[PDB]
Short mmCIF file of C-alpha atoms in Angstrom, two decimals:
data_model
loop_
_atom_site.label_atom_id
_atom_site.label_comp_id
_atom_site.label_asym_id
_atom_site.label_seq_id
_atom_site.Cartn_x
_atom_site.Cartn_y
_atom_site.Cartn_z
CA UNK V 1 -27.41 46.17 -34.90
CA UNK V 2 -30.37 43.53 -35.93
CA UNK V 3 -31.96 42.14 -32.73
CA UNK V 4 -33.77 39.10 -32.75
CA UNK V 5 -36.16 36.98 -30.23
CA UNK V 6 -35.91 33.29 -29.35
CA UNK V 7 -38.96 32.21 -31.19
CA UNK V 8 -37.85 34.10 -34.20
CA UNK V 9 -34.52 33.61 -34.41
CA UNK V 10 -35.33 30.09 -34.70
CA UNK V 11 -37.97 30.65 -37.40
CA UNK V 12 -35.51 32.41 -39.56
CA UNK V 13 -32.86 29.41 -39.12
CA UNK V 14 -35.69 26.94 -39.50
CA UNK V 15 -36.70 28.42 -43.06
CA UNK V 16 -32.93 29.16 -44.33
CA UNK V 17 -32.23 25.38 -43.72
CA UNK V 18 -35.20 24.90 -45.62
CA UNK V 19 -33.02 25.18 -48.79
CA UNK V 20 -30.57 22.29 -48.00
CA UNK V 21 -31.92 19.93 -45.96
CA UNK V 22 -34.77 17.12 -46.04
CA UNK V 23 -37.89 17.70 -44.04
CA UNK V 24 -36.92 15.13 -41.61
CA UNK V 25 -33.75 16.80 -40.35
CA UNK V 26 -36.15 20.05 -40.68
CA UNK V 27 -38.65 18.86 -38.18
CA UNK V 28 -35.69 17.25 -35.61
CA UNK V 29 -34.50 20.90 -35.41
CA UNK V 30 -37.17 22.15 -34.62
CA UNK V 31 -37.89 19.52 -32.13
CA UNK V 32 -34.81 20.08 -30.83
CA UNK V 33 -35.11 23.96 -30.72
CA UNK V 34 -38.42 24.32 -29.09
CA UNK V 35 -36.70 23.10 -25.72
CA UNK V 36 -34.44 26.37 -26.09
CA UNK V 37 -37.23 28.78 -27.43
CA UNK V 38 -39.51 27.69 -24.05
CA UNK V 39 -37.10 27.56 -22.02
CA UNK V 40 -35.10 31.06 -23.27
CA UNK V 41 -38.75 32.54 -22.59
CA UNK V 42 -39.21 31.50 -19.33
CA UNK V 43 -35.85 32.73 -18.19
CA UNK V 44 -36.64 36.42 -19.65
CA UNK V 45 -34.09 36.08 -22.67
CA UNK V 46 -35.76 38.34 -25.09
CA UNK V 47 -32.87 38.63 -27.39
CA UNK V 48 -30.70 36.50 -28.27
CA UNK V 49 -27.61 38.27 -28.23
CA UNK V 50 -28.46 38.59 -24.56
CA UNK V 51 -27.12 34.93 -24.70
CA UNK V 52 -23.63 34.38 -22.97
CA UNK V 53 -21.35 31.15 -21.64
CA UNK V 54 -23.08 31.32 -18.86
CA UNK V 55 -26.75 31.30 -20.00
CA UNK V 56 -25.66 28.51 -22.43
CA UNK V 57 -24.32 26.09 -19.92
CA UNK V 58 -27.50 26.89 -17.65
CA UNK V 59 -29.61 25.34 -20.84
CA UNK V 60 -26.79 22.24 -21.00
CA UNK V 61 -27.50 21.52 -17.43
CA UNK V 62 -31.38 21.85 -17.76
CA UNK V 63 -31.27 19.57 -20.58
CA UNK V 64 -28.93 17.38 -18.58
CA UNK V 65 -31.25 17.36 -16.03
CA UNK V 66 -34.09 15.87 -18.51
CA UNK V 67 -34.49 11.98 -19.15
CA UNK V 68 -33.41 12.76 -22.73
CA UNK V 69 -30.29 9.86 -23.32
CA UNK V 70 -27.27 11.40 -24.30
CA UNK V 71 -26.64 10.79 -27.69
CA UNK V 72 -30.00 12.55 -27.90
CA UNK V 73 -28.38 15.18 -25.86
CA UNK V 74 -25.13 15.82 -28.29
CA UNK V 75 -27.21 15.82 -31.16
CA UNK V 76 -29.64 19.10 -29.60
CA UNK V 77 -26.56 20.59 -28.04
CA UNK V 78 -24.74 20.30 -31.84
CA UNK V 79 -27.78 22.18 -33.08
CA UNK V 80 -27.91 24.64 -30.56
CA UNK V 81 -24.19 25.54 -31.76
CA UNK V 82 -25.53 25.62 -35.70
CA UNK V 83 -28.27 27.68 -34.76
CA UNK V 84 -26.03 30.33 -32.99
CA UNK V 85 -23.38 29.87 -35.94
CA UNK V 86 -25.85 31.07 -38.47
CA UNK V 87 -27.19 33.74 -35.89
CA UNK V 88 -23.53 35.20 -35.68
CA UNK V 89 -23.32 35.65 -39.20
CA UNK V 90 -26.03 37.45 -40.07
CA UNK V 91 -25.12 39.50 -36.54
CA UNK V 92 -27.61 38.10 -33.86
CA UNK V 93 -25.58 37.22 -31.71
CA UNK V 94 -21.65 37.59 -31.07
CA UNK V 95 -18.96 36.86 -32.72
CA UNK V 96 -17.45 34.86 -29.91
CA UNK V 97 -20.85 33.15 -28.71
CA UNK V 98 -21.21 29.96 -30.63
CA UNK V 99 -17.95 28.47 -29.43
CA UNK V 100 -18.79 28.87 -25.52
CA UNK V 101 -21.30 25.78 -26.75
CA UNK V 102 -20.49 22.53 -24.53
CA UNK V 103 -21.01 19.70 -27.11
CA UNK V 104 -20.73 16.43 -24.87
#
């Protein structure tokens, strides 16, 4: 039922791990989040439940294709899947959606 949009479904994960984690780890998701936002917006995704395996491993290989290292990599990839945990629920996204993450 509830639909949600890149940039604010990361908002609304951004503020609930406001509660339990320092400011540091707040700002590295972010970081790590904005490559998904701008890139989720380029590629027309105005929903994210519009996400599926396919969409998700595009974004893997886009970040792949990046001079990010890959420990750098695993640790935006692990909070991609998170994100997409939290989003499925509170009903964002599917059920099924967060485990079709690749975390190298």
């Amino acid at each position: 039922r509830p639909s949600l949009s890149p940039r604010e479904a990361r908002d609304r994960y951004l503020a609930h791990r406001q509660t339990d984690a320092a400011d540091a780890s707040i700002k590295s998701f972010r970081y790590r989040l904005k490559h998904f936002v701008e890139w989720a917006e380029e590629r027309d995704i105005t929903a994210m439940r519009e996400l599926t395996g396919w969409k998700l491993d595009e974004y893997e290989t886009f970040r792949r294709g990046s001079d990010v290292s890959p420990a750098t990599l695993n640790g935006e990839m692990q909070t991609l899947k998170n994100w997409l945990e939290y989003l499925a629920r509170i009903d964002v996204v599917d059920e099924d959606l967060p485990e079709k993450v690749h975390v190298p």
